[PDB]
């Protein structure tokens, strides 16, 4: 196991530059969710599924009473079943298919690797259910499309597209593409499936696995690709697992045809019959490239952390709990600024980054561009209060939080020099009650903002301020807002679904700014409200709760989000502060009981209590 | 005008009502794609193509045509001009005729207000682009072949005939006859994408004259498709004269569902904007409408909303407001309150049918059985009637789960018994989890997953939960070898890639619509509202603790019982969570404090004793004794 990992790392370090670039593109596409796997028959044979040549042999035996002397050609594989279908009855064909294919076979680890690569869709020429079984086990639901009618009623947005059909309806030759007749009339009999396959191939990054370079489907797809306009499509990737290394002439010939070939035999040395070894070699190379197990040098951890962090440079402050989602739970980011390795199995890039931060000599060894990127990363991390790993005071910079109303008015009066200044102006106007002007400014920003994170935040804030205006109008019934303005906002906000706002953003934004998705949710503080129960235990929790409250407040104020003014956030602040004070009082009473002679509140605590607590809530706090 | 549209709704034909129903359903599901023709662009006074044909005719022949242009002439005359006068003159005329800025008509905004999944347009103008940019709707605009691969979003604005974004050249658009002849060869990717979108969405045709070249080409392509292997596209016809019955029959048999604007409303034969706005508004204003007029419709709609929940043994009442999209508040005592139901009141009608047998009798047999099933569901879920009609209500609770009562002997007896159906397997897996045999519990849950959509999703969540608890138990023990290291390795291999957050998203949209309330089980959001509730009444009770003044304790107790019944009767492993136990402990502490106050001026029951014995620690009981 460990020897296999060391061998894989050695192979990657000696990998060709072209194969390295192909692996990088495949991993990037998988991260973006644009990856699709075209699964061939080799993956099925890896699970000992009955190969088609066995069926051809059975049909030949039934036709002539003896297996053919020699080897079938490519045309015979489709002709002999056709001859059996014609001269013999269709019932015999279907019965032989049932006798040969109604078997139960386990799913090979290659299916698990393909699924762990996170493909958007899976296109397969296999008529078996092995990939269906693997997807069913792994919990990723795929809309299995194997007939013409399945295309119209597709349940989900991700497809298990069996372009050659399967035996779900039954072990009948009419449901699959086996005979030469089926291949001849495939376009006529499967228009929708072929169109869907071509659309998926055009709109996604295709990786071919389980196919030979001389396969019928591969050549047909290359012929169709030949019809496309030059450079109007992405060249599909082809994983070649044949025992012998691919010839250079064949390699260049097929690369000119549009296939970027990663050849398993060229990467590692394996036995002639060890197909699973080569399949696992390629798939594991891709997976450990995804898992960052091949990052072995500095100025490369810098690139990865920069790719993860640089989109967040637009945002003023990032919650520590958001950094967990930024790195996909690779590290736990404690509120006190300490980082802990949590779930990453590859290189410890955060530890290397902190080592670079601590010692200047190792930092100097980086490249110039990587040195500047590290400088930006260090500024970002120190600004967000990330210091070092576990083994090694709140401050909110927002005029709205401190109630500097005159300064907010002054900032509003000046002329904005950037879109971010307009965003801050709109938030300040919202905090000052000028909600009509806030809505107009947010609409203007939305118009002029198409990273596009300011656009998303402006849409969120505009919906929030529209809800605030609606609730104020409902509770008032004075006319602070003209009826024309109310009608205009109603006509603008009708059928406006905030739930689909994030999904309508570009997928590059949806990958770079996953941590903002919670802003479109109706409720986003359920987690902290739930962990507030630890303060009710009667048997540190208080400091982490207070620091998380400070993190939420700083994120909502520094980034200028109107959701800070809603009832849910006020309720969360009230509950957290009340529970903290009650727990401190309980600790004081327990100590005075056991000893016989707690909470230290600061300016920020006073501001939070003043802004979020009602008079009744403060009365309850004093009474209890 | 709005009341005129309501009158049109009243006089709407049955088939038109059905078509509007499917269109609104597709819009709600996000599978609606709008096919915008040239009439919509013409509504904004955009230069029509016949003006360009006239200009080419004048430029080459020297005089305007005496008669009327035939269909082939619209493509032949520009082709002749391109062949003779060359490409430069063609592009110059195209530029001087098309580089105009035109305001977006309200029809564009009405199309966008339907939230289309995609907008396929034969127009080469940027009017839809401007409308999307103004409304704030982001659409990846695709007008060339290279734009298909470089799409920035999953929602496409597909200009199948191109546009002038690259420039005002004839090569960027499909105008002349040669462009239409070589369209399949010149635009393979765009045509493939259009065909795929049509196949995988609901298409509404707006702006076409039912005789356009594109409409007939799509009909010809549809003809080749397998019978009943596709959904019939909708065609909005906005011609002044009402469509003939024969023509309507001919086109409907060809794979079109035609909504005629001239049939719905009467307008002047030059008032095209009125004709477009009538159908667009009738589609828009039906988004909120549920098309509920008669009692059988009430029964059918409530059955459609409730029947997926028949798989679950019990449903939290507070969750029901999510089922009906916040139309009604379902209070914990069994009372319903009108919250956001703007249309006809189907819950009031259902209760009226329930109380009096006369209206229940005058129902269809299928609808009678549906109403009977709904009555059984609501009676078993504790929903009684509306708030106004509600009288005396008792806090009677029962939990029909062996795990809650701790019938460990019966637990093991049913465990050893052979399972009958997949529900029995699910219950047996929950019993294994409750019995401390998490190994066989995980194996049985994986077997249920393999053999399997409510049970599939519930078993996935339960399997993840027992994997988590196994990890925690192993960490605690090593921080005794209950589990073999081989089992730990296998479960770690199976579960490390699995993510519980996106499990609901990786579910069929039918499941994500029918079983929305189940999504909360993925995270602790399931306990959110109650927790928030559990806090506020606490403070309120504490206020009533000191000033000495339905009951708040009743609401807290009912929410507690609802949570317990939902988590136990549905056989969910979340009953073993620390957060859930803390919630139960806090609720019981508050209830006991209220009881202590009320005594010196409610009683402990069996279920209360079970909850205290299960979810409390010794220190909490000591604190309760002290206070």
Residue numbers in the entry:
A (entry chain B): 8 to 399, 406 to 463, 467 to 493, 504 to 565, 579 to 636, 644 to 670
B (entry chain A): 11 to 462, 468 to 494, 504 to 573, 578 to 629, 645 to 670
Paper excerpt:
The recently identified bacterial Sir2 domain-containing protein, defense-associated sirtuin 2 (DSR2), recognizes the phage tail tube and depletes NAD+ to abort phage propagation, which is counteracted by the phage-encoded DSR anti-defense 1 (DSAD1), but their molecular mechanisms remain unclear. DSR2 contains an N-terminal Sir2 domain that serves as an NADase effector responsible for NAD+ hydrolysis, a C-terminal domain (CTD) that functions as a sensor for detecting invading phages (as discussed later), and a middle domain (MID) that connects the Sir2 effector and the CTD sensor. DSR2 forms a tetramer with its C-terminal sensor domains (CTDs) in two distinct conformations: CTDclosed or CTDopen. Monomeric, rather than oligomeric, tail tube proteins preferentially bind to CTDclosed and activate Sir2 for NAD+ hydrolysis.
We initially determined a 2.6-Å cryo-EM structure of DSR2 in its apo form with approximately 60% density observed, which facilitated model building. Subsequent 3D classification allowed us to obtain a 3.1-Å cryo-EM structure of the apo form of DSR2 containing all parts of DSR2 density. The overall architecture of the DSR2 complex assembled in a tetrameric state, forming a ‘dimer of dimers’. Four Sir2 domains are arranged in a central core, adopting a head-to-head arrangement, while the CTDs are positioned at the periphery of the complex. Protomers 1 and 2, as well as protomers 3 and 4, form a basic X-shaped dimer through interactions mediated by MID-to-MID swapping and Sir2-to-Sir2 interactions, resulting in a total buried interface of ~4200 Å2. The two basic X-shaped dimers are further organized in a head-to-head arrangement via Sir2-mediated interactions, with a buried interface area of ~2000 Å2. A structural comparison among the four protomers revealed that protomers 1 and 3, as well as protomers 2 and 4, share similar conformations, while protomers 1 and 2, as well as protomers 3 and 4, exhibit distinct conformations. When superimposing protomer 1 onto protomer 2, we observed similar conformations for Sir2 and MID with a respective root mean square deviations (RMSD) of 0.205 Å and 0.373 Å, but substantially conformational differences for the CTD with an RMSD of 3.763 Å. Specifically, the CTD in protomers 1 and 3 adopts a closed conformation (CTDclosed), while that of protomers 2 and 4 takes on an open conformation (CTDopen). These conformational differences contribute to the recognition of invading phages (see below).
